[PDB]
Symmetry: none
C-alpha cells in the first residue's frame, strides 16, 4: 500500500565540514535548540516518519514564569 | 496506493561547508531554534513525513510570562 | 493512486558553502527561528510531507505576556 | 490519479554560497523567522506537500500582550 | 503493506568533519539541546520512526519559575 | 638652540580601530608600500627627524627591467 | 644645544585594535612592505632619529630584471 | 649637548589588540616585509636612533633576476 | 654630552594581545621577514641604537637568481 | 659622556598574550624570519645597541640560485 525509497550515492575527493558551532563571550543567556536530529557528514541523511492521528511536536527555546 | 522515490546522486572534487554558526558577545538573550532537523554535508538530505489527522508542529523562540 | 519522484543529480569541482550565521554584539534579544529543517550542502534537499485533515504549522519568534 | 516528477540536474566548476546571515550591534529586538525550511546549496531543493481539508500555516515575528 | 528502503553509498579520498562545538567564556547560562540523535561521520545517517496515535515530542532549552 | 615639545593627551570611553588592510582575489600584482612607519592606535603618534645635508628618502611601488 | 621631549598620556575604558592585515586568495604576487617600524596598540608611539650627512632611506615593493 | 626624553603613561580597563596578520589561500608569492621593528601591545613604543654620516636603510619585498 | 630617557608606565585591568600570525593554505611561497625585533606584550617596548659612520641595515623578502 | 635610562613599570590584573604563530597546510615554502630578538610577555622589552663604524645588519627570507 505505502512504499518508499530513498537512495543516496556520493563520491568526493576532499571534504571539510563544520557542523554546529555556538560561541559566546560575556553573554547572559544563549540557547541553541534543535527539535529534530543533528546530522553532519560528508554525506548526511536525516529521515523521520511519524504515524498517528494526534502527533504533537513542539520546540521552543526558553520559557520564563 | 502511495509510492514515493527520492534519488540523490553527487560527485565533487572539493567541498567546504560551514553549517550553523551562532556567535554572541556581551549579549543578554540570543536564541537559535530549529523545529526540524539540522543537516549539513557535502551531500545533505532531510526528509520528514507525518501521517495523522491532527498533526501539530509548533516552533517558537521564547515565551515570557 | 499517488506517486511521486524527486531526482537530484549534481557535479561540481569546487564548492564553499556558508549556511546560517547569527551574530550579535551587545544586543538584548535576538532570535533565529526555523519551523522546517535547515539543510546546507554542496547538494541540499529538504522534503516534508503532511497527510491529515487538520494539520497546524505555527512558527513565531517570541511571545510576551 | 496524482503523479508528480521533479528533476534537478546541475553542473558547475566553482561555487561560493552565503546562506542566511543575521547580524546585530547594540540592538534591542531582532528576529529572523522562517515558516518553511531553510535550504542553501550549490544545488538546493525544497519541496513541501500538505494534504488535508483544514491545513493552517501561520508565521509571525513576535506578539506582545 | 508498508515497505521502506534507505540505501546510502559513499566513497571519499579525504574527509575532515567537525561536529557540534559549544564554546563559552565568562558566560552565565548557555544551553545546547538536541531532541533527536547527534550523528557525525564521513557518512552519517539518522533515522527515527514513531508509530502511535498520541506521540508527543518536546524539546526546550530551559524553564524558569 | 633647537628645542621641541610634543604633548599628546587623550581620553576615550570606547574605541575600535582597523589599521591597514590589503585584500586581493585572483590578482596578479598587488603592492602596499610604506616609506615611513605604520602606526595605528586609539592614540597613535609617529615622529621622525633626519639631520644631514644630503638626506635621500625614496619610495616606489615596483620597478621592472 | 638640541633638546626634545615627547609626552604621551592616555586613558581609555575599552579598546579593540586591528593592526595590519594582508589577505590573498588565488593571487600570484602580493607584497606588503614597511620601511619603518609597525606599531599598533591602544597607545602607540613610533619615534626614529637619524643624524648624519648622507642618510639614505629606500623602500620599494619588488624589482624585476 | 643633545638631550631627549620620551614619557608614555597609560591606563585602560579592557584592551584587545590584533597585531600583524598575513593570510593566503592558493597564492603563489606573498611577502610581508618590515624594515623596522614590529611592536604590538596595549601600550606599544618603538624607538630607533642611528648616528653616522653614511647610514643606509633599505627594505624591499623581492628581487628577481 | 648625549643623554636620553625613555619612561613607560602602564596599568590595565584586562589585556588580550595577538602578535604576529602567518597562515597559509595550498600556497607556494609565503614569507614573513622582520628586520628589527618583534615585541608583543600588554606593555611592549623596542629600542635600538646604532653608532657608526657606515651603518648598513638591509631587509628583503627573497631573491631569485 | 653618553648616558641612557630605560624604565618600564607595569601592573595588570589579567593578561593573555599569543606571540608569534606560523601555520601552514599543504604549503610548499613558508618562511618566518626575525632579525632581532622575539620577546613576548605581559611586560616585554627588547633593547639592542651596536657601536662601531661598519655595522652591517642583513635579514632575508630565502635566496635561490
Amino acid at each position: 500500500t505505502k512504499e518508499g525509497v530513498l537512495y543516496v550515492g556520493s563520491k568526493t575527493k576532499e571534504g571539510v565540514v563544520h557542523g554546529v558551532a555556538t560561541v559566546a563571550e560575556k553573554t547572559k543567556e544563549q540557547v541553541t535548540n534543535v527539535g529534530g536530529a543533528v546530522v553532519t557528514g560528508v554525506t548526511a541523511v536525516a529521515q523521520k516518519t511519524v504515524e498517528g492521528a494526534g502527533s504533537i511536536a513542539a520546540a521552543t527555546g526558553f520559557v520564563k514564569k
